Structure formats: C-alpha cells, structure tokens
Design a protein around this ligand. Structure first.
Ligand SMILES: O=c1[nH]c(=O)c2[nH+]cn([C@@H]3O[C@H](COP(=O)(O)O)[C@@H](O)[C@H]3O)c2[nH]1
Ligand SMILES: O=c1[nH]c(=O)c2[nH+]cn([C@@H]3O[C@H](COP(=O)(O)O)[C@@H](O)[C@H]3O)c2[nH]1
Lengths: 321, 330
C-alpha cells in the first residue's frame, strides 16, 4: 500500500538504523538448533510459542503451535519443517528490534524441496505481520514472459517488498518484475552491480563501454529503466547491490548516483570493513545504504547480542557522518 | 562394456540418446496457469482420458511425492481431495506431456520459474517430474539461470543435482566463473556436473551488455564464453564426462556462427524457436555439429500449448531431422 520507499523511510524514523539482517539458515544451523533445544528443554521454541504473530502464519500453523515433545512423537514427518520454521522465528524474535529490513536468500529455502518453501512463506507472513520491510535475495533473471512468474511468486505469493535481480540478459526484464500493467502495481528491486566474490573483476570491471567499467554501465541502465517505469513516482525504486568489500566502487556509485539505494552484503562472514563500507556509501537518508549481516548474526551463539552490537556500531558510525 | 541407467556422465548419456533417436530436439516443459486450468477443464469434459492413460504407466509408481494422491481416481480427487486438486492436475498435465512426446526428445528442459509461483505445491510437482524423467532415462536440464556467491550457490547445486537428480542446469556467470567450482563440482563427494552458461540471449535488448561491453575488441559474450571454457578445463569436466556449454539464442545468427567457429566442439543450447519465431533452418545451420547433441534446439509452447502435443513434437522432430540431413548431405 505505502510503497517500499515509504516503508523504508518510516521504519528508519522508528528505529534509526540501516542494518539489514540476513536470514539464510543452512542444514547445520537447523540441525544445531534442534540439538540445542532438545538439550535445553526447548527454551527458545517455548518463547516462540508465546509470541502473538505465530498465530498468523499461513502454512501448517497447527503443527507449529504443537509442543515439541509431541511433534517428535506424533508428527515426526513434520519435525524438520517444525525446527526449520522455529529457527527462523527464533532469529526474527531475537533480532527484529534492530533490523531496518530482513533479507532472505532463496537458495537456503529450496534444497530440501517443497518443505523449505513452506518455511519461507511462513517467514514472509511473520515479517509482514511485524511490519518489517523484506527483501528476497534470489538474483532472478529470464526473458519477460518467464520472469512474470517470479514477479507473482515474490510480490504476490510471498508479498515481499523487494528482490534482487541479475540484469546481465538486459534491462527490459525489469518491466515484468517491477511493474504489473494489468493491476497497475509497482515493486522494488536491487540489481547486481559490483559483487563480493574474489573474481568479481572479471566481468564487472575488466569489461567496459566508452571508458566506463561494466558495473557503471549496468547501474546507469538500471536507473534508465527505473525512470522509464516511473517507479519513484510510485514510491518504489530500482537500487544497486554493491559489495561491502568494494570500497572504490561504493565510493564511485554514491558520488555519481548521489541519491541511489544501495544494498551491501559482505560484512562479518566475508571480512568487509563496516566503517569503510558505511562511510563510502553514506547517505543522510541512510535507508539508502543497507548493510546486510547474515552469518555473523545467525551463526553467532548469541544472535540478539550480535545484532545489537552491529546496530550500535552502525549507529556510532552514522553519527560521525 | 555396458553402463546402467544413471551410472554415467552427462556427455555419455547425451551421446547415447542422440545415437538412439537421431535428433537434437529439446522439449521445453513450462506449464503456465492457463495450461493447468485448460488440462483440468479438458479432462473433466472427456472423462479424464489422458489421466487414466498416465495412471497405466509403470514409472508413475516410482515418483517420490504424494503417490497416494497421484494414483487416485480423478473424480475422487475432485470430490474428496479438493485441496489436492491443483497439485494433481498440474502433475498430471506434466506426465501427459512427457508421455505423449518423450520418444522425440533428446532432452527435456524445465524452467524453474513456472514451478515456483504457487509456493511449495509446484516444487512437489517439479520433483515428481524429475523423478519420472529419471526413471524413463530422458536427459534433463533445469533452466533456473542460477547465480550467487560460492557458499550460497552450493545450495542450488544440492537442489538441482542431488534432490532433483538433474543432468544439467543453466547458470548466469556475470558474478564470475569461480561460482562454477560450487556448481559443476562437489568437493566433498568428488562429483562433477554439467551446466550451460548464458552467452547470448533472445530478449530484444540482449545486446545492451552482451555485445556493447567489450575487452580489447572482444565483445562480452565472447569473453564470457572463453572464461567458462577455461574453468571447464581447470575443473577437468570433460575428462569426467561432464561439460560446460553455452546458451545462444535461436535468433542470434551472427553470434551462433562466431561461437561455433571459434569453439568448434562446444555444447550449445538454443531457445527461442516456435513461440518466439526464430528461423529453424538458419539457427541449426549456424550452430550445426556432426554430434547433434552439441546443438540443442529448445521448443516449448509450440508443443505444450498445442492440443495434440505428440503430433506437434513429431512435426518439429521431423523438421529438425530434415535440416540435420541437409547438413549431413552438404
Ligand atoms: O547480491 C549479492 N551480491 C553480493 O556481492 C553478495 N555477497 C554475498 N551475497 C549474499 O548475501 C548474503 C551474505 O551473507 P553473510 O553475511 O552470511 O556472508 C548471502 O545471502 C549471500 O548469498 C551477495 N549477494
Ligand atoms: O537461457 C535462456 N536464454 C535465452 O535467451 C532464452 N530465451 C528463452 N528462454 C527460455 O526458453 C524457454 C522458451 O520457451 P518457448 O519455446 O515456449 O518460448 C523458456 O523457459 C524461456 O525462459 C531462454 N533461456
């Protein structure tokens, strides 16, 4: 209803941060949560059950509301579903007060087949109820007729606020991601611009047009497409993914597209330097520089304290600027 | 000297099937909501003729997900299993297309995008479709254009190659080629897998990065093709009977010619004929290789939206084969 641009601004006004918490649970995370809960008499699951919005998830709610002892004995074929969903609710419950947005990477929810997609749906439902801005990190790409299916999955079924998109095929795909002509609906996306992987230079920097490196050409074309679609007129936007370890490019992008929205993964697990990243990407409307932190929170044995410290650090750095 | 079903690299599986059926037709299975709806409507009007034929087929008993539901009488689904109706008709539409057309297919390509928009239910269908194709021993491609950093992309590898047991998938390597180490190789199991990387695509604005960006007067698509091959060599794929190949759009004649000229023995997958109207003779000729399986021609909607998909598939098979013969007798 309000539009992601407005959602982000309003939440930033309430919580005064740009922390984006990544929720990418792996098999080990789920297995560890199960083992740990069994050893501590299900303390975190019990807390989850006292939360109000658990009552508003779409998929197999009755299963999720059952006591763990009973799941294990009477609904054993749902055990993985139950512990996977409860791990997610546990992370969200422990950390949401510090989060401007949550980013869920689709790759983590698919490798078990359908079960993880039911978890992902419930996670999006839970975040929707909590009014927390969401990002689906799926790096979608295809021809127009095909990508409309991703638009439906992401923006209609999950009701995500935004997604990540790989526009190497071209920018016209965005017309079938960020806009629904039939319904007059508009949606936001972050396009891959400069990524964190060690060999990112190979195509993103080493290729060029008119003495500008590819990542610059790609950012400008994404903005051209945003203008064409009139997204910002409709309280939505196309933004850029710029790796937290990519200081020169972050500096270049913020200088040359002064009011762009940037999503920056790669701090914590991948060594990115938080001070340098946030400084090079800084904007006074700091929802425009989302700092994504995943494993440094989700693989930390004290996730609430980990989130708090990133919140506190970001806010100290934001203050300097 | 005989290898059993599932126990050989994709290079070998493709070669063997190409020797068997002598074509390069790749049938695309991309069912949309209209297709599923229309299938349900048509079956309801004809007392489920096609579903009952699906139910006769031996390997329907070998799929993993909800056989109890898939094997029910269709009027029982409608009356007694309302919440399973969409799952049942979606899955049966897919089995129907496969049963009707597989004898003409060198490979089936399933585009992930079509299986995800209803949430988990389409992933169950997708899993059953892959299980069914594996039982029939038909070469498979999961068209998902996956990309991420290595630690994340391993999850797609698990989904595609371990869960679905796909033979291959499509990959977008704009992030870098190092991601391929986590897709085409599993270091824990020492298993190798095949992929097609995006090189030149069919969308109208495909030149904007693929042709406009360059390094030293080589266009991006050429550099990306070369870097993919360099990674294949590093990973020893072809020594392990797997490969990294290229997606080159059916409509991209000049690029198809360059790629086949400069990488003579590469594997090419070519979508964009039929519903997207490329010139088949022109595409197949520019991409031709005497080992036909190196120039896969994908046809999806022109078969799956035809009311007689078996005959549509035979017609494309025959049309392709005639062009293959022209090249063989040139
Ligand atoms: O669009 C992207 N461009 C990037 O350069 C990049 N680097 C990491 N990732 C993804 O972000 C998350 C990183 O999470 P960690 O904090 O756990 O490393 C995970 O979800 C990763 O898949 C990227 N996504
Ligand atoms: O990797 C790709 N590069 C391309 O240039 C391209 N063009 C179309 N497609 C996909 O192929 C299928 C087209 O199916 P139709 O015969 O029904 O149009 C569908 O699955 C489309 O998503 C492409 N995939």
């Amino acid at each position: 209803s309000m539009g992601f641009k407005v959602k982000l601004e309003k939440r930033r006004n309430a919580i005064n941060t740009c922390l984006c918490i990544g929720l990418d649970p792996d098999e080990k995370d789920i297995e560890n949560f199960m083992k740990n809960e069994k050893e501590n008499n299900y303390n975190n699951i019990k807390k989850n059950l006292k939360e109000k919005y658990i009552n508003n998830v779409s998929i197999k709610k009755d299963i999720l509301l059952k006591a763990p002892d009973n799941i294990i004995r009477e609904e054993k074929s749902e055990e993985f579903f139950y512990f996977f969903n409860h791990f997610c609710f546990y992370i969200i419950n422990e950390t949401n007060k510090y989060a401007l947005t949550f980013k869920m990477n689709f790759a983590f929810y698919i490798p078990y087949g359908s079960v993880g997609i039911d978890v992902l749906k419930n996670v999006f439902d839970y975040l929707y109820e909590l009014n927390i801005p969401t990002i689906l990190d799926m790096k979608i790409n295809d021809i127009g007729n095909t990508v409309k299916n991703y638009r439906k999955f992401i923006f209609e079924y999950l009701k995500s606020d935004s997604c990540t998109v790989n526009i190497y095929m071209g920018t016209n795909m965005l017309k079938d991601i960020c806009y629904d002509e039939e319904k007059n609906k508009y949606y936001s996306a972050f396009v891959l611009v400069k990524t964190t992987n060690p060999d990112s230079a190979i195509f993103q920097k080493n290729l060029s047009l008119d003495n500008k490196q590819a990542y610059v050409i790609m950012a400008q074309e994404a903005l051209n497409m945003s203008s064409y679609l009139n997204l910002e007129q409709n309280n939505e936007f196309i933004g850029f993914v710029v790796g937290a370890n990519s200081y020169d490019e972050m500096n270049y992008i913020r200088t040359y597209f002064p009011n762009c929205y940037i999503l920056s993964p790669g701090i914590g697990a991948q060594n990115g330097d938080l001070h340098k990243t946030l400084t090079n990407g800084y904007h006074k409307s700091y929802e425009k520089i989302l700092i994504n932190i995943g494993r440094a929170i989700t693989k930390n044995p004290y996730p609430q304290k980990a989130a708090q410290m990133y919140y506190d650090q970001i806010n100290a750095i934001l203050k300097q600027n």
